[PDB]
Amino acid sequence: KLLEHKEIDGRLKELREQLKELTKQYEKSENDLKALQSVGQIVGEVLKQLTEEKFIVKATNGPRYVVGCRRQLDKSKLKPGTRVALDMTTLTIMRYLPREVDPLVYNMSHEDPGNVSYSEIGGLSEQIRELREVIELPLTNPELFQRVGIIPPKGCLLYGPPGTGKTLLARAVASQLDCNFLKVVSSSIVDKYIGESARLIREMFNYARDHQPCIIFMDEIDAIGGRRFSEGTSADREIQRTLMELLNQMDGFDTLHRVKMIMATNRPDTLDPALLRPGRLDRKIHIDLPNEQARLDILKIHAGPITKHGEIDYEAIVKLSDGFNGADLRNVCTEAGMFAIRADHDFVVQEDFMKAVRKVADSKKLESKLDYKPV
């Protein structure tokens, strides 16, 4: 009978399993035994080409060198401008490389999983169609402009009082592109080195030409914008150099095409007239305090998931809401539950809303109330 042969296989197959799994722990650890012999390579840049073999480079360290190559590495393809790798010891060219993508901008491109939409914004749909006209319409249908004979605008800015939705409106656009939408906080781009503030604005807009349908968003430009000076401190010397690098990359000696720019500020009083020029910023979109129909709309957006009882007169809340923002109407929906959070009412009565308005209404007695005007 072969039944005693199946009993003997339970030891041999358990013996051959101790050969493969124990050597697999020696397999991967043998990869590191010879992976520790590769040597790093100097990253350089090709300047010109003297002869077939005489090349001339400059590292990203310092001095300029005269260098050779391997005889197999496509010497016709090392154009003056490309980025290459070198040898450390003999200092020769090993390998051509593509461009670099400077990880401040990689961590600027696609780190937003935010999923807000045009349904959440309310009250300013006139400007939403206005803002769509520069970033969505000629990107899909360019021929109508070519038939009339004018060029679509480069970029536009958004100004208004604080808390009307200038940041929110760009987040609606941000959930549409997801790969070539560049949002900038306009204060991460500055550091204490010599030219590193101006290297980013070069290399952001170099990344914009590589992904041709693309949007640049520039929030709170009053950090980097400024007017100019008669040179008071030594800090704003090299900010105006960072600022004049921005002005040139917009409309100096370049077909600024398919690269749209959206900018936002609380006060445009402090902006350089060279930057509010109609060559660089084309349209000026004014966002205001919400109307009573708009205050009706914004309130209903934020009163969605509120477990209430159906007696809510939305008119009287708007009737008291005078000169409010789009932001404190979120506060009223927030603070109405703060009266429900005492006395343990899991619902929200209609009475707490008129309580909620009258506490917000006098807390903004201490505001400044200056509208603002771009000049």
Partner: protein, 70 residues
Amino acid sequence: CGKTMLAKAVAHHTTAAFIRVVGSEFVQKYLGEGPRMVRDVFRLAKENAPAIIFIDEIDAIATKRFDAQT
């Protein structure tokens, strides 16, 4: 007022070599790169041709006040 525009039209109908630099790029990070970056522009305008240099936004370079401590 057509400052950059008139320089475009000159660089289109010219027959001479045209060298076009942005004047906020001489401030490199490493020391000494900038003065090397100046002197080989004019050397390249020397060896090449009866050329033309264009430099824009000289306010990035030529200011009035300085400070020899930073």
